[PDB]
Symmetry: C3
Subunit: 115 residues, 3 copies
C-alpha cells in the first residue's frame, strides 16, 4: 500500500537521478497515502519486446490497499504514463500498467499483516 514497479528496456543511465523520489512524491499525492508507506521499484536494462518490437517500452504494476478502481485507474495511468514519457522518453502506447487492489490480510509488513 502502495507499491509501484517499473520494468523497462531503457538503460540504467537514462534513469534520471531523483526519479524514485519523484515517483514517490507523485504517488503520494495521487493516492493520498503517506509517502513513508510508499515503495518504488525501477528495473531498467531489461530484455523486452512490445508488439514485437524492441523500441522503448515498460511493464508496470501498482499495488495498493484500496484506492484502485475505474476512474482512479484512469488518473494513475495518465499521471504515470506522463512521467514515463517525460523522464524515460517512453511512448505511452508502449506502456502497460497492471493495477491490483490488495486485500489487507494479504499484505505482510513488519511481522504481521494490514488486516
Amino acid at each position: 500500500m502502495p507499491m509501484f514497479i517499473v520494468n523497462t528496456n531503457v538503460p540504467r543511465a537514462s534513469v534520471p537521478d531523483g526519479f524514485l523520489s519523484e515517483l514517490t512524491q507523485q504517488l503520494a499525492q495521487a493516492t493520498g497515502k503517506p509517502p513513508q508507506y510508499i515503495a518504488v521499484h525501477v528495473v531498467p536494462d531489461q530484455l523486452m519486446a512490445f508488439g514485437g518490437s524492441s523500441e522503448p517500452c515498460a511493464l508496470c504494476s501498482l499495488h495498493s490497499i484500496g484506492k484502485i478502481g475505474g476512474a482512479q485507474n484512469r488518473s494513475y495511468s495518465k499521471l504515470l504514463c506522463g512521467l514515463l514519457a517525460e523522464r524515460l522518453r517512453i511512448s505511452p502506447d508502449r506502456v502497460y500498467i497492471n493495477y491490483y487492489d490488495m486485500n489487507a490480510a494479504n499484505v505482510g509488513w513488519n511481522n504481521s499483516t494490514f488486516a
Copy 2:
C-alpha cells in the same frame, strides 16, 4: 492483453536470437490476440532454486484480459513448457507458470485504461 514474463537461472548467453519474436508470434496464435498487443519479458541469469536445487528452472506469468481459463491454461502450459524446454533446455517439471485473468479497468495503457 497479454504479457508474458519468464524468469530463469539460465544464462543470458543461452537465450537464442529470435526468442522474443518467437514468443510474441506463438502467443498471438495461442491466444488469438494480435501481436501488436503482446508484451514479452525475459529475465535470464537469476538467482533461483526449484525444489532446493539449482538446476535450470523458470517462474513465469501470463497476464491477459480474457483468454484465460481451465482448458486454455492447459494448452498454454503445454505450449510454453514446450518452448522453454526446446529453446532454453529447461525441464518442464522445473517450471511454474502463473495465470492471471485481468479485468480491463485494471490495465492501464496509453494514458488511460482499457474497457
Copy 3:
C-alpha cells in the same frame, strides 16, 4: 505452490550462499508442503526506495495453491521478516510481502496445470 520471490536493494555479495536453501527448508515447514515443490527467487542489487529512503528494503511475494489466509499470513510474515532481518540485515518495517492464493487451474507446471 509455493513460490517465494524477494526483490531487494541489498548487494548480491551480501546474500548468503545457503540463503535459497534456507528459505526453501523454512517455507516447507511453514507451509507443510514438501520441499520438492518449493520455488525461491532472490533478486538483489535493485533500484528501490521504501518510504522515500534507499536504506535496505525488500518487496516480496508468496504464491501458493492454498495455505494462504489471514492468520497463516501473519505467521508467515513473522518467519519471513525474521529471516530477512537476520540474513540480510533488513529492518522488518522496510519489508512488504504480497500474499497470493492461487487456483490450481491457474498454475502451470510440467506441460499442464494442477487442475
